[PDB]
Amino acid sequence: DPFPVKGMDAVVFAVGNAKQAAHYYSTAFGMQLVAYSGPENGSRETASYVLTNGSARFVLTSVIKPATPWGHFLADHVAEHGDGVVDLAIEVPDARAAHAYAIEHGARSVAEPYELKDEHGTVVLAAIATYGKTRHTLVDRTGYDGPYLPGYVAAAPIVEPPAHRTFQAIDHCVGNVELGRMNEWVGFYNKVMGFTNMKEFVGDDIATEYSALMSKVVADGTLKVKFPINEPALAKKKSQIDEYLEFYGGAGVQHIALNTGDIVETVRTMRAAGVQFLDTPDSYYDTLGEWVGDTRVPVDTLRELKILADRDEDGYLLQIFTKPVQDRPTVFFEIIERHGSMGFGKGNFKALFEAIEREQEK
């Protein structure tokens, strides 16, 4: 009500080779190029590709020859953190209202409300800062009907789209922060955006023995925009969050979860298109039926495809994670098919731990 959001406008990646990245997400991930902005249309400093899959939208920008503060920012970001997210854009009914609200409540401004206008309409943009070097651009595109944003031109798919759509929406966007900074960012979203803490959290219990991490997730009123916040935790095993902060060079987006209507078909398509996922211990499946019960996907194909599952009091979910999409063990993706569960797979930390422990006896 006081800080209304319509959903994620786009996940903007600052990358070293936008042309090849756009090819990767088109083929490996099955997305489709719909808009572009570069030298061929008068935008000489950066090349920007807009890929889409249902309502999921990724923007891949790369600086050609730095000349403005933004250009120099991207160049430095890519060199320092490697390919990663710089903007978790949020669509709002009113950018000026949202910006003022966020600033009145403590947020730091990255961009004052401004307007872009072309033959397709007007778009009001505003931006505030969140963890590390990441920002949230507040986008009011109610008066625009073009390809993406004024300055962008329609573009054709780099390749034929896959027979079955790989994904159709963004479920959640996860951020990794330093130890001791989780609750601070959680409070930030509660205050600055009027978000609400969801029931599911990864507490000290699971944190120190199975996950090596603590998490809490904030979401808007409609439960569309969901932002889980991870932080390292001491366990017997090295923390994947610490490894992230170490190789990324600070706080940043760890992974983006994408909704699919058929995770089985999504994985078959993605695997054949060249994407590798995590290797789930086969013994995980031996005891899956005992704690998760029956699923719409028989255990044999979950086992064949390395797909995971989790069950809570509201239902269940099917999930799978890709390996990092760069060489730095930093950002990766998650494909998720929900069936009642509103969780994030917290039960798999223990399940996989105990599953590994018994592969080690065989």
Under the rule (CB under 8 A), what is the footprint of a second copy? 15-21, 23-24, 26-28, 38-39, 46-47, 62, 64-65, 75, 78-79, 82-83, 158-160, 246-247, 272-274, 324-329
DSSP 214: E
DSSP calls for 262-274:
-HHHHHHHHHHTT
Among 174, 192, 225, 318, binds ligand NTD (CB under 6 A): 174
136 appears as a binding residue in the annotation: no
Tokens coding 45: 């400093």
Q: Is 349 in the site for ligand NTD (CB under 6 A)?
A: yes
Of 113, 130, 253, the residue nearest 192 (C-alpha): 130
Strand 46-53 and strand 32-37: the pairing is antiparallel
Q: Which amino acid is at 203?
A: G
Residue 202's binding partner out of a second copy, Fe ion, ligand NTD, none, with CB under 5 to 8 Å set by partner kind:
ligand NTD
Binding at 158: pick from a second copy, Fe ion, ligand NTD, none (beta carbon under 5-8 Å per type):
a second copy
The token pair that represents 10 in the structure block: 């786009």
Binds 308: which of a second copy, Fe ion, ligand NTD, none (CB < 5-8 Å by kind): ligand NTD
Please list every residue from 63 through 122 that binds ligand NTD, using CB under 6 A.
none
User: In this complex, which beta carbon is closest to ligand NTD, that of residue 308 or of residue 318?
Assistant: 308
State the DSSP H helix or E strand holding residue 303, giving kind and residue range, or none if neither. Answer: helix 299-305
Between 78 and 253, name the residue whose CB sits nearer to Fe ion. 253
Q: Which residue has the tokens 């090819």?
A: 23
In angstroms, how far is CA 142 from the centroid of its own chain? Answer: 24
Of 280, 296, 298, the residue nearest 354 (C-alpha): 280
Kindly report the number of other CB atoms within 10 A of residue 323's CB atom: 13
Pick what 62 binds: ligand NTD, Fe ion, a second copy, none; C-beta below 5 to 8 Å, kind-dependent. a second copy
Task: Looking at residues 215 to 274 of the shown chain, list those that interact with ligand NTD (rule: CB under 6 A).
Answer: 215, 217, 228, 230, 255, 257
Which residues participate in the annotated binding site for Fe cation? Answer: 172, 255, 334
